Amino acid sequence: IRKGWLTINNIGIMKGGSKEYWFVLTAENLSWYKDDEEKEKKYMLSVDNLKLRDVEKGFMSSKHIFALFNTEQRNVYKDYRQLELACETQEEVDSWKASFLRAGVYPE
């Protein structure tokens, strides 16, 4: 449905620090890659059982930040905490939120 680069702010101490990843969004699954060639296949999460929320001032929010969180568990699989995503512009945040909603993600 939508593809682009997104920075993940929540990464564990073993690999901590915000990092930019290539993301592919479809109606069925969310697939994250370290490359735009879509070969790494870092981790995947299903579209459903997820919801979109805003974020608090817990990060140096020089970017436009929104969070996709698991409604069944406390964290995203193969990830640290919930998937807080930072965009270069606010339009990217709104576009991604709309894309996730169309894919099947539900509002908080």
To one decimal, the resolution in angstroms is 3.5
What is the C-alpha separation between 85 and 6, in angstroms, rounded?
6
What is the C-alpha separation between 46 and 76, in angstroms, rounded?
10
Structural biology method used? cryo-EM
What b/e readout covers 13-25, taking b as 16+ CB neighbours within 10 angstroms? eeeeeeeebbbbb
User: Which residue pairs from 23-32 have beta carbons closer than 8 angstroms and sit at least 24 positions apart in sequence?
Assistant: 25/1, 25/96, 25/99, 25/100, 25/103, 26/1, 26/103, 27/1, 27/102, 27/103, 27/104, 28/103, 30/68, 30/103, 32/8
Under 8 Å between Cβ of 8 and 96? no
